[PDB]
Amino acid sequence: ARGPKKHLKRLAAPHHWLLDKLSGCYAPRPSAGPHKLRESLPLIVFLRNRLKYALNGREVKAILMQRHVKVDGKVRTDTTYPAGFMDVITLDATNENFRLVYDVKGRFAVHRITDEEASYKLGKVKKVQLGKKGVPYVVTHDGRTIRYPDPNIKVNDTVKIDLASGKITDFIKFDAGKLVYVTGGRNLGRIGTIVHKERHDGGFDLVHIKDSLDNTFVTRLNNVFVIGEQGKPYISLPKGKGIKLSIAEERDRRRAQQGL
Amino acid sequence: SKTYSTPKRPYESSRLDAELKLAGEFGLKNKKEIYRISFQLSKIRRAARDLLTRDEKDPKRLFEGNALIRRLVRVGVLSEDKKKLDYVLALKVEDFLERRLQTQVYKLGLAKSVHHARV
Amino acid sequence: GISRDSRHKRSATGAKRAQFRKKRKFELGRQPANTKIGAKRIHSVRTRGGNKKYRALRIETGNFSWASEGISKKTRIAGVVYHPSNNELVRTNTLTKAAIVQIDATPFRQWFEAHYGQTLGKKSKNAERKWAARAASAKIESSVESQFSAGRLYACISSRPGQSGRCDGYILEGEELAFYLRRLTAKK
Amino acid sequence: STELTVQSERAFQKQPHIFNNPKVKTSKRTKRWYKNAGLGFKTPKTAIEGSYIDKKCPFTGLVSIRGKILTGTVVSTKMHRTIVIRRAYLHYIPKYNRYEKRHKNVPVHVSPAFRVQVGDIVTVGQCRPISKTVRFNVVKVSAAAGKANKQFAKF
RNA sequence: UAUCUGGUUGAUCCUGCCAGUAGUCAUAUGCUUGUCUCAAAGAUUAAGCCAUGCAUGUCUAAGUAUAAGCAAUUUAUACAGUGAAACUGCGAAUGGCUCAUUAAAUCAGUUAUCGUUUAUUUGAUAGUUCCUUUACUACAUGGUAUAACUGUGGUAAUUCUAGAGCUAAUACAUGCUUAAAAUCUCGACCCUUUGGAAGAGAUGUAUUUAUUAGAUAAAAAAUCAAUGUCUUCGGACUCUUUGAUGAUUCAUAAUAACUUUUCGAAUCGCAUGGCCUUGUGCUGGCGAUGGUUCAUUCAAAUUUCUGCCCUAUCAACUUUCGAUGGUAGGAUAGUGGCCUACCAUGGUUUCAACGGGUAACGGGGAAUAAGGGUUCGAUUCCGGAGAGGGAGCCUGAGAAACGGCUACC
RNA sequence: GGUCGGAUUUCCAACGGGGCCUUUCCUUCUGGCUAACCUUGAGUCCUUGUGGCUCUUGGCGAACCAGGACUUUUACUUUGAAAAAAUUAGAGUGUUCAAAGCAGGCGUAUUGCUCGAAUAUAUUAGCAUGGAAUAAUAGAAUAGGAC
RNA sequence: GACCCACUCGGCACCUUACGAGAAAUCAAAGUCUUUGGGUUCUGGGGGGAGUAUGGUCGCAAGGCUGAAACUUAAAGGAAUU
RNA sequence: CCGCCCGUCGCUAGUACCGAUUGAAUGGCUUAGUGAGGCCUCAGGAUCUGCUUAGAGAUCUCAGAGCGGAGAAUUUGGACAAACUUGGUCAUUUAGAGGAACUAAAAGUCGUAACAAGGUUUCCGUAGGUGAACCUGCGGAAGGAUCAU
RNA sequence: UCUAAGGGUCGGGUACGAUCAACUU
RNA sequence: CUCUUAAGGUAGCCAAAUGCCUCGUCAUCUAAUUAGUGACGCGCAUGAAUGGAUUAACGAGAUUCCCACUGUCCCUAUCUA
Structure with missing residues (x-):
């Protein structure tokens, strides 16, 4: 005890980093940042383990100490910088703009995007308050404070951020008939067009969702994240589109898909 | 991250007869090898027992039973004529030992004995 | 020092609890x-x-x-x-x-006299205007008006x-x- | 009830930052603060009209109900502004595939907005700690009597 | 792979145990031992503890370097390459080790903070401060010490240090420079009845207190204290400012003041450009560090519900100098008998209280089982503790710290 | 089997849901969409028996949610969320097999492509949800009873 | 009123049989129990030591209730058979 | 049936019990007393130092005196409280003359209590007595040697 | 040097006031 | 086994205020104990209303040990009337 932990062991790290456990030793502890420890992805993991551009932490550091890579238009030469959901990673090598999104199994899908799409990102407003001198502000999921927004931006709406100016271009309300990208939970990575909402004062508001295959399900509103209207997302979605083809369908695919 | 187990009665001459016959037929140095095949076969049998207790047209049954059947077929233990998840229970140590390589060398020729094949 | 903690007290049943931790600066009293x-x-x-x-x-x-x-x-x-x-x-x-x-x-006495033009116990155009405007309020209470005598x-x-x-x-x-x-x- | 008349104690009992100016001759002479505790709990007329203070009250006081809401039977009324409720339940033992009766006693603060009697069922809500043992406050009552007083009148 | 066999009798059937049988990431030991892969390992007994001998500090283009150090920049006469030391700043509160104490207590899952702290990260965020606010001044940027260093010494000895002489700082202590407008009070003055006025002062942020606003489901008319913006001064009167939560005395704002008075860059590196009234003139980039508050993050502290082994040859415990609650205060980061003052007399218990024992840290889990279950869990994850026993405390965001101090044993 | 061991329509039937009517309220109050509509405006490239692709302005409240009202209480059960990671079971896969591991496979291997790293279980407590048998509980008798 | 016949409720029991049960002796309950679950209380877990020692509690006492361990042992025991 | 079998006494060995000794040892908890240390507080003021009229030719003294600021030793009171002493209490081990049991051995001594009607039918409870088994009384049972006038 | 507690007699336009005096803790 | 008595000393108790031998023997208490206590018992010569064994409380009763306390003592000295 006696102050905060600085280490993190292999087996304690979230399962969606995919490394190895039994006395494999240590894992990269995300530094404090915009995102939470578990719902985040450090750059060392994004670069050594997913993209295979590097093989070692010193290689990753050699990369990061050259202003090559930037998160949200800013360099972030920290090794264990917690990058998270809907975060834009930009490498001038290959001019590859990486959006961190979720695949359907719950891992961090490595989405490649256009520069015009990397221009912006999205943010779920967590609270709307008045600050000092009567100045209203909204707080997003990525710890971004934005002053003097549209007064119609109420809580759980989502917001389009221009990422160079921390300003708001357009907002999307929380209502029925709106797309959703589930963040957190069993049903993580699914995309399903809110059916309706269940209030439960003092009791964790629930949301009922319906995939394109009419596979209805239910999640928690803290885990819901809106992204657009029916059939008009605001982001390039990954390969899979959040459907969760069952294991049977998956084997039927990878047996009939391809004899390789 | 480790595994294996062995039998119950250390004697019972009928078993000794059967085991030594298999050992002589298939060129084995130990009873541990027969025990190993019986262990594998027991795992398979109890898996299939659970699945058969499950409902027909049940997703876990279909998935895991087809998988188990596919594995045994591609090994050649389960013939492709009997592919229904009951001969998986009817299997036997002879049917596994026949697919061992030593036995396959001999039956394919090329060694004129199972002991020569092992060597 | 002074432990501002409950582990030392007793259970609500009357049970004597065991000394369970060395004192913590969390639980600090001064x-x-x-x-x-x-x-x-x-x-x-x-x-x-x-x-x-x-x-x-x-x-x-x-x-x-x-x-x-x-x-x-x-x-x-x-x-x-x-x-x-x-x-x-x-x-x-x-x-x-x-x-x-x-x-x-005394500061309240001075303020009252300069703000209402009225004493307790016992001029210029702007001041008279103000006092006449905000009159009909210098009527506080027998008790406070009596305290002001003593001061x-x-x-x-x-x-x-x-x-x-x-x-x-x-x-x-x-x-x-x-x-x-x-x-x-x-x-x- | 509670016969504090209103000011039984050696300090003056008032609601903090609730100021009744003797200057303004308001035609009520009754300035109180109450709140809706929330969760569809009805604020009683005894609390709105009363004279008590009770800083630990969820309607006129400073505490707030947040967390759990429980129910129980009053098995004691012998303290001042607090009661003890019985919370009975069945615990499953799987070895026997059967249940066993268990109780926990739970001390509760009760405002003088409620006339509480031994036997009455009472619904309580989680508050901040307000004593060594008390973490809950009465927020609703259901008397299991029907005012069955004349049934004792027999002649 | 839901299996049993030998033994009581002269013999039989039983009850019933003893014995055998199989396994054990359960230990020990004995005999034997060619190979490959994987590999636990002073836990049990002495939380005696290893009682020997060795180890956690750290720098960049970017806080301070006259090393009486190196090389040489040959771009330099103030430095401007590298760089020991030492000051400063961060860190040492993580990790690792062990299981002694611990039986509603840890702990597990599940809640809550509308009950609080939070260095760091991350994002936002200080025209308001010349206190006689027209000389009072340095704002092209003011003051002092001190280390390292030099040299004289003490002691047998330790990461002991004294006396004397220098010198620095995002050390310490101080301290100015940037609006405009509006609103308030005070108010010379001239005056009215409709009264209007020139000047002075205050209005950042933080602290403390008091007060106020922080609204709201809907429709027509009389009266008035003053008409009020504007008037057809008939009164058209509409226009209207009010966010969030299930819920607040919330967020926030405004009044009156309060403070021993906080913060509001005397900091640093590279690039050197633009404009003329060509002055070492005015403007100006990319960063670093630091900084108030808010939010976020890493957390922490408290907390709800339920749940733990054996004992009745422990049945009545608690309240004595707190047990249960109430009012008030103090203390605390905050809630709260946490602590006391006054008051009341409650609270737990055969649904096993309290007490005792544990060869008892808790769980995730392990072993063995047809199914149900029994036993184990010192551990390679999680969190509790502890550093020979006790207690106390400095520093700091964070320790009741022990590879940190203080004392007793 | 009308395409060449895979599929389709009306099908004789079975198994499970939903709605409505039978005296059957199987919660309503303030509302919108008023909707699934008397909205019908000339109406149709169909085996007249409806296997059924098609529009012109104006009806009933949940199919959409805003608030409210009151709302007997439980136990039980379904579904879901919650259920740290490793371990357990288990899918896939050349560790030379296996224990393991989460790797790896495919090309013209002449400057590339690509599948992945599933899934399930995890009693009890708590949360939400559908059911409403079984088992308790209350519901108008000196009527303070209902609309 | 007492007797006789038939019936009936409730009792003390009895004779016969085994559809069953049981190790058997025997049992209309000791049945309806491996085709294992109507409700509920008490007690036992090989034989000895030992119902002893000790502690409590009741009792005038005699004693009652509660009640171990060490140690020892492969049999003790129940029904039947010749 | 020349079968089985009970107890006393005596020898040997072992196990535990009682027991004078206000026994002993160890450990935990604790009253009371004494009470280190640091923390808070009332004081204290060695020393250093800014300013100021002061003693002295025009970032300075030469007697000194006030406004202060930092501030060590020491010190008052308080809470926290180690440790020690003295008692008490609980638990666990342990000695002990003697006493009284159990078990086992051993071809010991005295009888022969039970198993056949075991030669007085056995057993239960209670009470008394006797070398020992046991006997007797009172009531009860058949597990009786009688399912029967 | 203080504090607290412990009483008597009179009054109720059909919740409390005025007045008096002990010692004990 | 024998002699013998009216009966042969029972339950209990003991070197006891009862035990000669006797300062009995064993243990405990002490550095050391003819004392004390606890046990042993063919007890010169214990013993049952010439009452036996025991007993809380009581005792200017006899007795042993411990603590405290002391001029009892080591070892005496001084003061007052």
């Missing part, structure tokens, strides 16, 4: 100081997160509010007996929150001097004032 009157003496104590607390010893002044009129004025404060609180940690005839005290009354006003301390370092308060008025002096039989 020693008061007996905020008396006279010769301002304030010591700063470092607290959790830094966050200086200003332990007052022997204040002399305070800031007292007259709310029916809606002002606040600095005055000197006067006698005390308290508390009905303690035996262990604070000792001597202190000054604290919820204590009734006598205060100077010492009953007030209650609202600040916690051992935490903040001040002697802010409010002048008694109404049902409070009707209530209070049947009490204040205390030392320590």
